[PDB]
Amino acid sequence: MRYLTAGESHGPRLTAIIEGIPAGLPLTAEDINEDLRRRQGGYGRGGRMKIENDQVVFTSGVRHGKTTGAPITMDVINKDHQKWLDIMSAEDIEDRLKSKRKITHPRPGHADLVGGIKYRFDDLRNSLERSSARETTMRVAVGAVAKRLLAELDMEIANHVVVFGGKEIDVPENLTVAEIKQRAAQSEVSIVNQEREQEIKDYIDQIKRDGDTIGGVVETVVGGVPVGLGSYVQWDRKLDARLAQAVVSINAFKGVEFGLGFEAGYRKGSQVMDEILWSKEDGYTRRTNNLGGFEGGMTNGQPIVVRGVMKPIPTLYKPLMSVDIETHEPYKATVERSDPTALPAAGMVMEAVVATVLAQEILEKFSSDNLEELKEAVAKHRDYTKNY
Amino acid sequence: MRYLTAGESHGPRLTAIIEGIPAGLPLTAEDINEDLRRRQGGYGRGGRMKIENDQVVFTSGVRHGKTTGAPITMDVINKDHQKWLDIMSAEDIEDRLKSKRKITHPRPGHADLVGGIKYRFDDLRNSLERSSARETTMRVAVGAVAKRLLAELDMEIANHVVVFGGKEIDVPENLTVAEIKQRAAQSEVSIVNQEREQEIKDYIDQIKRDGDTIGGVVETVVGGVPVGLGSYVQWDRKLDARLAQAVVSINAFKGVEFGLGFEAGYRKGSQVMDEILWSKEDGYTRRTNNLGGFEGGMTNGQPIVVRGVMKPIPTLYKPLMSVDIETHEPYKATVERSDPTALPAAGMVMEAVVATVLAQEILEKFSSDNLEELKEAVAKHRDYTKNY
Amino acid sequence: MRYLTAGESHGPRLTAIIEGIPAGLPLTAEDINEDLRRRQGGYGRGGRMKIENDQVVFTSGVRHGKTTGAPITMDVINKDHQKWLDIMSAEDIEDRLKSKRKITHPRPGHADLVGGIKYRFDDLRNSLERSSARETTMRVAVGAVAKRLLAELDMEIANHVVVFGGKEIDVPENLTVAEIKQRAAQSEVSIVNQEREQEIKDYIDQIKRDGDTIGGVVETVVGGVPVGLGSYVQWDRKLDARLAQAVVSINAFKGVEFGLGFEAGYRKGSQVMDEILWSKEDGYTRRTNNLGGFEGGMTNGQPIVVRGVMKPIPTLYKPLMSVDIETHEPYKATVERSDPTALPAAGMVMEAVVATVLAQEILEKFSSDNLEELKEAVAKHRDYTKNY
Amino acid sequence: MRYLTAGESHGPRLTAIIEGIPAGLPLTAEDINEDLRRRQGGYGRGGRMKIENDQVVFTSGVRHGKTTGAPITMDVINKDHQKWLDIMSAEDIEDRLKSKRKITHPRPGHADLVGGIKYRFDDLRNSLERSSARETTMRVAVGAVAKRLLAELDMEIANHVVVFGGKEIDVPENLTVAEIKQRAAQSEVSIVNQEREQEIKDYIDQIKRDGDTIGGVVETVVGGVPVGLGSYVQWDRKLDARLAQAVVSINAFKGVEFGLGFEAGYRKGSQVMDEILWSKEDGYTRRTNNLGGFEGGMTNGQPIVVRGVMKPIPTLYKPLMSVDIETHEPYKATVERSDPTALPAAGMVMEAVVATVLAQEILEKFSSDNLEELKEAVAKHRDYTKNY
Numbered sequence A, B, C, D: 001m002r003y004l005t006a007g008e009s010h011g012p013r014l015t016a017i018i019e020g021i022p023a024g025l026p027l028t029a030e031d032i033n034e035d036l037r038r039r040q041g042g043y044g045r046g047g048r049m050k051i052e053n054d055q056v057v058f059t060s061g062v063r064h065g066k067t068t069g070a071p072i073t074m075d076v077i078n079k080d081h082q083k084w085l086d087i088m089s090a091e092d093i094e095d096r097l098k099s100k101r102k103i104t105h106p107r108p109g110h111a112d113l114v115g116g117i118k119y120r121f122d123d124l125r126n127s128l129e130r131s132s133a134r135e136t137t138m139r140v141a142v143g144a145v146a147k148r149l150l151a152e153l154d155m156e157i158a159n160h161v162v163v164f165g166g167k168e169i170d171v172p173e174n175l176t177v178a179e180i181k182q183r184a185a186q187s188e189v190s191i192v193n194q195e196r197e198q199e200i201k202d203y204i205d206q207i208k209r210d211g212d213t214i215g216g217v218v219e220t221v222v223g224g225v226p227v228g229l230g231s232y233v234q235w236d237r238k239l240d241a242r243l244a245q246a247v248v249s250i251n252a253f254k255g256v257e258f259g260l261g262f263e264a265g266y267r268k269g270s271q272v273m274d275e276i277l278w279s280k281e282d283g284y285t286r287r288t289n290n291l292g293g294f295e296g297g298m299t300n301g302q303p304i305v306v307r308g309v310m311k312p313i314p315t316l317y318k319p320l321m322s323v324d325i326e327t328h329e330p331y332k333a334t335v336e337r338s339d340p341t342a343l344p345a346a347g348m349v350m351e352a353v354v355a356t357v358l359a360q361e362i363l364e365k366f367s368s369d370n371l372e373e374l375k376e377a378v379a380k381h382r383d384y385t386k387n388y
């Protein structure tokens, strides 16, 4: 299974094509819209998010509620585009109008300047329009399709904020994936423990009044995973490593870690390995989950636990120093529309990207031209695993 | 450029094939051997590291001291194989001899059990032989070819330990890559500040007496990096993300971060973006390097700064709890030859892997059938960059 | 450069995304539409070709006349979809309405039955809608983008029919690419010598009235190609082999050959090899082009000459024998809407696919994040080639 | 599954690494060696083939007679290397010695000149050593591993010469794969009709005394093929097209065709489609096999029938004009002893590459981390197919 996303922030619309989903999967637009809606939200996002109402339009690969195995195409319109018809026209317009919203003041922390050097642009809007996170809308759309697959295979996934601009959220011990998703869904900041709900909001508004931005750490958990997805025989077959690329490819993300993660570099061997247990009732399991679901680049059957750090949004309403690309003189950075933080939204993109890599791995490991054989292949493999 | 590594820990030899290096790159067995030697070192490694004397043998693609563009084949013999001629024989032997060194007690933390389930093994040695970090020897070897290409393009790379089993190393501000390489080579634990050298060493010794293991955090730095390598136009073209997959693919790595890394989730935007500066003498630069060389998934010209966390080595001489796979009874894990720590060596592995990806990215971006045209494409791009 | 095509024959629309085209390439909807029009033509096409008027819509990656380097999305609407609103709805509909246009009598030669076994379909139109050649419309839209790149690099391409249902064309010797393009465009069956045009039209009418079909052989020729695209150093880098996959992947194609092709298996070495020549004026050239522009899987600078055989359309109006997948009784294949032949269109698809593969090979060989750098590299390479 | 081949014709040895073969496959050196012996054979092959005695050495991935799922490494020594130790040494040597056997006279029909332009060589030996068909030895080694997988899945493969230097071999009607395999290797020229055996040998001799070369056409046939391998959903998923690239990648191959092949462009649809039949005994079948086992890029369950044309060996005793690359002066190329033909050996290479691609497709289609699950999946899939 593979895919490509396309579209510009202020273009007419976004598009994604997914090639390789099995035939037979029940799939509706509501299956996608629920996640699209979750991605637009989170306390701290404003502006564009109150202008868009992201919903999907399928134009291929889905027939009468089920996929057919053909490429699936999903669209999401940009309502805002009616204000950028000339500026973002595909066709040429007269010289004289091109100057409009032309960007020559790169913003620190964004792709503007380097995208201009690489692609040799005279207008950095040509870097901005694609590098913008509006694109994550289609990543979530692809992840919602991936999630339908995981749901048919009795797997569960959830995401929650565990660090918000420095505030470490004390998560209760031994929550199920279902509990994580339900608690988190009740918060406007995706935290499982809310006595901090009002405290974090206040802070986002401080930061907001203060004219600054914050980021944090988001955690994705996956339950019911089959054992032996990924492989140690070659470096690029390791599933944790595959997930690492996908997480870090999310706009603003600067790191990814599994289970204890970086803490594992501060502890002893005996405090980190997860002992192996067996029962006639359940077959193999592990006493603890410090490795976050992976042994040797492979799923061991415990929950997958991965965290990603999102740096603060680069756009500051209180600029920062930059340089004017036409004069080479220092100046403040351009101020494009943005928010004090988009962390909860980033955690939804993270959930979608993890689900997507997972679904890719499942489709590669098991017979999967169609849902029936895949579901059969997975049941058989879970029976084998249980009785090993 | 692409490659495959092969070989078992106690098989006769390790092998690697590299396809796609440009013709005309000066390359010698000593260019490789220097790094193989580093990989074998580091206070805390014993056993095998005194038996093996890792050196390469070229058998294709190198002629008269230069690559030809054809596939390069490198071999590294396993001197230890002499003690395993029967056990690791490619051809069938007497059934009665097959139980030798057979493993039925998986080790927590290692690939034993899950590899056994995935591949349907009755002898967990079949997992161990290939999941062993003995394979990282060939990754270092491929890395040494990649480093020669970086050297030809005026780039420099180094690695050092910045956290050793929880002891954080105090790194002097403003060191060049060359100083980090030089100071680290004077330490038995690869730290650039030897004030904790004896303390780290005695800590290792304690760990070993205590019968436990420790990991840490290694940092790789790359200097003189061309701008605009990597792209934001699609997620899987982001170079930070490609490095992420490669770093976490290293045995025992549970995480990866760039620049400030996870600490960016604890700061404000104004304390994280790197301001943009310009001078007639140097072109564009950045005031600070909190982003570790990456904006928008692309190199910004600042030093690339990446860290990976190595969990503690799973094999404890004081074995943890497990299960006998033939009887399903609880039992202590198998105790195989291992060391209290392999962090310094992991650092070298990371250095090679980072270099590998980077050379791959350079070979994608520039005309690179031969070194001549590659060097010219790179100089020309550097000139463009400098004058943007 | 990579791309995906998507869409069903009777769904709402077709879509394609191309990822990786350099920034800076002039591109308009007319650059695409000219080839979409060619593809709908050819004496012998009717039905659908009378309902559709294929024209593109760009929704991403194109701004004010040029590419930006971001993913390019193209749509082609299916006007006919208004007749299939229920039959092809993405949303589920009442069970009884699903019998509408349901295929249970598979057509010999088409993807019907096999797709039904592979994907576990009960309705074989689910095989039909995606396997149908309506999809070639988007492969031609991608080729048109590829062809714009080839034109900025001073390359030319043309296609022509050389066999039309067994009638071989007597092709004058030593025509240029441009001559081929011009002469074939003045013919209603894309033949460059019209002595048999009326005979071929009369034959097509005959096949039609008899409820039969015909295919033939088309030839694509590419001029001005750079030397050394492709490589012999690994089998999958050979450019003639890469083209071979792309040509056979066109619907109804059953084979591909280069230069003399299969005739080379009937002649002696001395009658096939192309002698090497050199002059201060032209640099290296070849006396003849029996090899069709390739030596060792690499372009040698002569015209690329490649031929593909298109088998006859499978859907015959006097249907062949098949089986009712519901009762297992013998029954005549279903008769869907089809032409007696679509060879001239198939020629345009083949021109597009060849140009695509070649653009991809060029983008891989040369620095090509943007058009300016790509043009400078190709000029430089041509300079080195001429003066070798 | 993927693999890389490496080595020079006059280097010390050839090497291949295959990654992704399921654990559990019985495999021995003789499994490979049988094919390697066939590949050295064929009337018309002389020189080298009498010195070389190709046998494989396994150095990884094979233990006690079975694969383990890790990367497999195979070596084949070049006995001829002994006469080239200086010339082909990896390490640098005195400048005065580097001109030994330097090549500056490109052979028409070979990779020489174009390779030296591409890779900017002064010595065309660096093109020649790797472009040589000596490399096909490792492609046949790889194909032998693939063939072992096919045999475990009850599939059979064979190759025979159908056209020899223009002599069309009259093949009996409807030979099975096993018949073709048996008859063909009773022949020193791989033909299934031995009334023409002496005739072809004499013709080969005649060509040789005439100082010329011949090529021809080889047909590979595959039986017991599962249905539904390959897909129509995207062009690059079609298995006929994947086989096309593999076949045209063989040195000297200039075309590939399936079933009736190019003859399908001369016939009518009624004379080409294969009618679909069903019986309670055997399930679905076809009345004829004009399509060569493919419908919509997918296997239909009839025997795969593919033919490739091999141009004649380019090196001749008859003169062919070329140019001296150091002087730009014309010269006549002539080789006193060259083989007149390598067609029967090319047929072995064709069988191997075909077998390889099929194994790859099978590994992709079905659950295949280990042989046991693969077998189970294939069995389940044939039961579904038969009972559709």
Ligand SMILES: Cc1cc2nc3c(=O)[nH]c(=O)nc-3n(C[C@H](O)[C@H](O)[C@H](O)COP(=O)(O)O)c2cc1C
Binding pocket: A109, A110, A111, A131, A132, A133, A136, A250, A251, A252, A253, A311, A313, A314, A315, A337, A338, A339, A342, A345, A346, A349, B294, B295, B296, B297
């Ligand atoms: C959900 C989400 C929303 C974002 N919103 C904004 C925003 O409003 N303003 C901004 O400057 N960056 C925003 N970002 C961050 C930028 O897209 C990103 O920092 C930039 O493209 C550079 O890529 P990099 O930070 O990964 O290096 C957002 C990211 C995510 C995941």
Ligand SMILES: Cc1cc2nc3c(=O)[nH]c(=O)nc-3n(C[C@H](O)[C@H](O)[C@H](O)COP(=O)(O)O)c2cc1C
Binding pocket: A261, A262, A263, A264, A266, A267, B166
């Ligand atoms: C058991 C343990 C676990 C820790 N885990 C991490 C970690 O995962 N990430 C990190 O950045 N620091 C980690 N450290 C470092 C401590 O957080 C650090 O010493 C502390 O925050 C004080 O920092 P300061 O000296 O910079 O104020 C940990 C320390 C210990 C003892």
Ligand SMILES: Cc1cc2nc3c(=O)[nH]c(=O)nc-3n(C[C@H](O)[C@H](O)[C@H](O)COP(=O)(O)O)c2cc1C
Binding pocket: A294, A295, A296, A297, B109, B110, B111, B131, B132, B133, B136, B250, B251, B252, B253, B311, B313, B314, B315, B337, B338, B339, B342, B345, B346, B349
């Ligand atoms: C240089 C290096 C040396 C290692 N040496 C050991 C060792 O002696 N014993 C051990 O159990 N693990 C060692 N490992 C770690 C194991 O290979 C590894 O934990 C195991 O394959 C499971 O992979 P994972 O930890 O990535 O999940 C080493 C890793 C590296 C990078």
Ligand SMILES: Cc1cc2nc3c(=O)[nH]c(=O)nc-3n(C[C@H](O)[C@H](O)[C@H](O)COP(=O)(O)O)c2cc1C
Binding pocket: A166, A168, A262, B261, B262, B263, B264, B266
């Ligand atoms: C400014 C700041 C930065 C921090 N950076 C990190 C970090 O990068 N990684 C991490 O794991 N913890 C980080 N933390 C947490 C501290 O390391 C500290 O040890 C933490 O509060 C844990 O203490 P506890 O786990 O005993 O409550 C940071 C804390 C602060 C105030």
Ligand SMILES: Cc1cc2nc3c(=O)[nH]c(=O)nc-3n(C[C@H](O)[C@H](O)[C@H](O)COP(=O)(O)O)c2cc1C
Binding pocket: C109, C110, C111, C131, C132, C133, C136, C250, C251, C252, C253, C311, C313, C314, C315, C337, C338, C339, C342, C345, C346, C349, D294, D295, D296, D297
């Ligand atoms: C331009 C074009 C038009 C075609 N139109 C038709 C048609 O009208 N009816 C039909 O049965 N097949 C048509 N085909 C062929 C089928 O799509 C094709 O034979 C089928 O998908 C099975 O694929 P295969 O022939 O490659 O095995 C056409 C092919 C091309 C290139």
Ligand SMILES: Cc1cc2nc3c(=O)[nH]c(=O)nc-3n(C[C@H](O)[C@H](O)[C@H](O)COP(=O)(O)O)c2cc1C
Binding pocket: C294, C295, C296, C297, D109, D110, D111, D131, D132, D133, D136, D250, D251, D252, D253, D311, D313, D314, D315, D338, D339, D342, D345, D346, D349
């Ligand atoms: C089995 C085999 C043996 C070959 N032996 C010879 C040979 O002895 N001499 C020769 O000139 N070409 C020989 N060839 C052909 C060349 O390798 C080939 O023409 C050349 O590398 C250029 O590639 P191309 O013909 O695919 O363009 C052989 C090919 C094969 C498959």
Ligand SMILES: C=C(O[C@@H]1CC(C(=O)O)=C[C@@H](OP(=O)(O)O)[C@H]1O)C(=O)O
Binding pocket: A009, A047, A048, A049, A131, A132, A133, A134, A135, A137, A251, A336, A337, A338
């Ligand atoms: C549109 C989204 O976020 C955008 C991401 C973003 C940026 O630079 O990354 C900039 C803003 O877009 P705009 O300037 O139109 O307000 C964000 O709002 C979205 O998530 O759908």
Ligand SMILES: C=C(O[C@@H]1CC(C(=O)O)=C[C@@H](OP(=O)(O)O)[C@H]1O)C(=O)O
Binding pocket: B009, B047, B048, B049, B131, B132, B133, B134, B137, B251, B336, B337, B338, B339
């Ligand atoms: C051989 C190396 O490391 C090995 C990696 C390792 C493991 O499980 O990862 C186990 C030990 O191997 P053995 O049991 O033979 O001593 C390590 O020493 C090496 O780095 O070259």
Ligand SMILES: C=C(O[C@@H]1CC(C(=O)O)=C[C@@H](OP(=O)(O)O)[C@H]1O)C(=O)O
Binding pocket: C009, C047, C048, C049, C131, C132, C133, C134, C136, C137, C251, C336, C337, C338, C339
């Ligand atoms: C639509 C095209 O070709 C179609 C390919 C086709 C088939 O089996 O391949 C069937 C017909 O479509 P329909 O049944 O609507 O008339 C063809 O005309 C086209 O070239 O644009």
Ligand SMILES: C=C(O[C@@H]1CC(C(=O)O)=C[C@@H](OP(=O)(O)O)[C@H]1O)C(=O)O
Binding pocket: D009, D047, D048, D049, D052, D131, D132, D133, D134, D137, D251
């Ligand atoms: C060595 C093989 O074939 C070789 C292929 C070949 C060529 O250009 O392709 C040239 C000859 O090599 P040389 O000139 O040393 O004899 C062939 O013999 C072989 O099949 O193993």
